[PDB]
Amino acid sequence: YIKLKVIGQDSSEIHFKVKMTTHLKKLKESYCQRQGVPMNSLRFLFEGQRIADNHTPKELGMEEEDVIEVYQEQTGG
Amino acid sequence: GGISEEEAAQYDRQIRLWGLEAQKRLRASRVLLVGLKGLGAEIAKNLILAGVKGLTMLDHEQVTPEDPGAQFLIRTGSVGRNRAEASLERAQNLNPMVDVKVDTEDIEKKPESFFTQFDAVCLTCCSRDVIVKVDQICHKNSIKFFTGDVFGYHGYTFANLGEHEFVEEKTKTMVKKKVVFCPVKEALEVDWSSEKAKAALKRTTSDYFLLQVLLKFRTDKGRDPSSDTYEEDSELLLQIRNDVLDSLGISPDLLPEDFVRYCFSEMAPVCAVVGGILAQEIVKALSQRDPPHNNFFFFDGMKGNGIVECLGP
Amino acid sequence: SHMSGIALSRLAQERKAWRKDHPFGFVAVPTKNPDGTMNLMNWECAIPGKKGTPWEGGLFKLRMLFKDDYPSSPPKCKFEPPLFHPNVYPSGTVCLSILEEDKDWRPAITIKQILLGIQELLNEPNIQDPAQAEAYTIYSQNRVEYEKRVRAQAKKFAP
Amino acid sequence: RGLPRELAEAVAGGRVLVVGAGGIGCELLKNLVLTGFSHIDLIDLDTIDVSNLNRQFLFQKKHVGRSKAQVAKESVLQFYPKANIVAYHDSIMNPDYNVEFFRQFILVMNALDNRAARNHVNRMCLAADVPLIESGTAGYLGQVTTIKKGVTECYECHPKPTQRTFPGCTIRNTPSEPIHCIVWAKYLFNQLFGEEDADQEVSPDRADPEAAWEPTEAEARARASNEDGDIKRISTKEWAKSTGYDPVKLFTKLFKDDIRYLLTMDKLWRKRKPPVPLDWAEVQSQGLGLKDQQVLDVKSYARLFSKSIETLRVHLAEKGDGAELIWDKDDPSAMDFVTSAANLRMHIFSMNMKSRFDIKSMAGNIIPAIATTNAVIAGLIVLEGLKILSGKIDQCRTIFLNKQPNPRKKLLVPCALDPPNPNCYVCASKPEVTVRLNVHKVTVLTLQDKIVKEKFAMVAPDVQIEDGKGTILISSEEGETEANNHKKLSEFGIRNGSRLQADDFLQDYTLLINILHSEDLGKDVEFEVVG
Ligand SMILES: Nc1ncnc2c1ncn2[C@@H]1O[C@H](COP(=O)(O)O)[C@@H](O)[C@H]1O
Ligand SMILES: [Zn+2]
């Protein structure tokens, strides 16, 4: 059980509780459901590297209370 | 409140972003802008479109043949005119409800009482000593101080808001925060002889040292590096980098030797990006809404990084 | 009518899959443009009544509308003409759980699946979420008259 | 100029296209002109509004009502006469801008605000094999990305919604959010005054004028009186037109009788608060910020509803041949109608009434915008274009603009461009044969048999004009598209530069065909493939 922090472009701080061996697709789906936007528009990257569905925290070496950055694509201007 | 129907109609898009109260705070603020070059032109355009009470464009230099043919504020054939006078018509046409003024006097000769009428002073293409003097004057009289520059693919932005109080939306709504800034004499002369200082240097972007080198170059030659003198200016820039980074007890190696290929002339996209960032910082400081960035912002056009640094404390 | 590339490719693949193998009696063909071509984003469907049910013997025409968000958004299905059913709006729009993205709709589910779901809802409705307030009324009050009306409607729509 | 000589020549001789002349478009055009670009094509469909003067700087108060592209070109020519700006006052979705139009640009820059136009421009650039720079902006945020065929991801590799849809029953039966009431008001405006659309009919159709309830008690009389279909369910729009669009009867039908109609279904109000109908007489007799930011009482909103109904009825009567109205957020009467109806519906379902400011923000999908964000995004766009034109596509990155620095102290976050999705179906490589033939002198039957059935070896081909609307010309079914076999190819909009997709059932292989018009071919052959 590793605690993860996901912050958006507007510094929307939301905590997550995920397992060591589970894939991160569940985290993306849960964040998409909670924020009300489909996960396709959002991109989650770890230390500047995009997180794929098949990635796991062990592959990326995540530690307790770590930060995940999510960037929503804007349709306007 | 005091916002007219036409004002609301033409400001609706930014009102919906940052509140009528912050719009009103913007409407009662006067900004002084020095160095109406490309970066100065971008900052002036953005501030006038934002809808400040007034903007005093100061520039003692005239339009020269070496300047770019198109300048977005100076009509073609205006060679020999004053830059502020040339750009005044277009700047005023940008927004009719903003009192855009022109000052052709030198910034050095301006007395301290001249700066008291403004609540925000922005400096562009100014020497280091002028920057220090103007920042000291602004800090003494409690005036927000900004300065920035563009050189090749690189740009920088500095802000000295003193003891700044603002309101920021709560994460969950209007909460109050206070941030303390530092003068230029402390930001540009940060000591690097401590373990914490060494770690910060390991984590500090190299654009700060490039800014120091180019400030020294402007202090020495009296002008920014020019494309037509690329070889001599590049050799002098390398020498200045060596001496400047040796005087601080730092290893010049962290600043790449090829930095001289991307710090020449002013570029329109770099001007646009840096002017937008600096104008947003000025608007945030004037409206006292949203946390202003740390005292330094650095932009790299080739790599695409915009890095905000806190140096001086 | 301007649709996205993924929506158009998915609709073409869906049409090919339907033409390759579809349940007997069901009809799902893209509508005809006034020019003479056929429109992939507008389908003229037809759902047969299930045998052994009061809806049997009738062919109920349905219209399928796809937007550019397809398949990320469900199609808008409506009966033309609107029929008498607790879960069908008076405007003809059919309210189904699988036809709404926030309730049950998934982008991987096919036109055949939703047509079969509409047929199943036709065979048996749900009352927790009615949409008619008249079919619902005479379904909850006395079922005999509801079955009589359903039989008359099915006879009216017999091909 | 600070550019290298090779890049200087590349940008001076090259021709670029800017689609969209908004705030981002204006900043991008100014930056391109200042950088050294001489041949720029600008296309925009809108006209200058007074709300555009916050972002757009090439437009003034005296330019309101004029074309955005022409005024932008004139403003750019004011400080740089040497610029060869070509302005189009049209939509990029127009068929005139085919692959032949997109093939003359060395770089295409997106400055749009909707996903549909972005999808069309992405498809056209992918077809024409022209690099595309895609950008967006919303408030303090924004991003810039590069799209290249076969190198980077396209706009459809990871599909995104174009607009948010709502459940059919939730909007009209069980609203739970103010946005539901707002979209209900918009759909009601379309139903009462706009064109026919069964998906926007939010008010149920029945015997309207009589105020009726307790159908459960009188179900026997109701079923004796009405047959299946309920006397064809007299249309609400027809009844409103017949009554003369009088505000009182419309108010009673929409906010009292319709709510009582909802209350008949007692099964879906067991776990939610039932709505409370409003009586017009009771509402009438019951007795800082901007003026649009003030929330009024239900009586003032009922009066506003009546006034808006009267004004819209007058407009409909004045309109020629009874043309249907189209909702516009900038129309005072339509905006008043939507605000009043949405607020009344919110009050009915026990929700907080919203000011006209918020109703306009949510109904019109207004995105906050400022000049600084657009300027930053345009500068990043021009930097990416300079990187592309110099052969440095490997150095191009997806740059994100943040409102506040991330924990890595990055206000601008560049990300490496991802490789294309192998299963995209949009940017995937497909055979792209091209044929040159007389469009006006060839039939659909000849296209199907002579040049597709046997020339390209297709047994059961179905053809589809890929104009973006998904219209298919030839169907492999033996009894579907035989009526237009003898019709000429020009009668379906096929012209020079039009491309049509052809896929086979048994052969399970597709093929793209590019049509090239040629009057001089010779009497021997009506078509000729081009290697
Ligand atoms: N095909 C198109 N669809 C939508 N907007 C377009 C199109 N072509 C040009 N535009 C313009 O592009 C601009 C994009 O919006 P904005 O960035 O908010 O100014 C608006 O001025 C639009 O009118
Ligand atoms: Zn793709």
Short mmCIF file of C-alpha atoms and ligand atoms in Angstrom, two decimals, chain D residues 153-157 420-421 424 426-428, ligand 2:
data_model
loop_
_atom_site.label_atom_id
_atom_site.label_comp_id
_atom_site.label_asym_id
_atom_site.label_seq_id
_atom_site.Cartn_x
_atom_site.Cartn_y
_atom_site.Cartn_z
CA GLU D 153 0.63 11.00 -32.95
CA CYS D 154 -2.22 12.68 -34.81
CA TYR D 155 -5.23 14.36 -33.22
CA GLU D 156 -7.29 11.15 -33.39
CA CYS D 157 -4.69 8.74 -31.97
CA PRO D 420 1.80 7.14 -33.76
CA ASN D 421 -0.82 4.68 -32.55
CA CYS D 424 -5.48 4.61 -35.03
CA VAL D 426 -6.86 7.71 -39.16
CA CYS D 427 -3.09 8.13 -39.60
CA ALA D 428 -2.49 4.48 -40.55
ZN ZN E 2 -3.39 8.61 -35.38
#
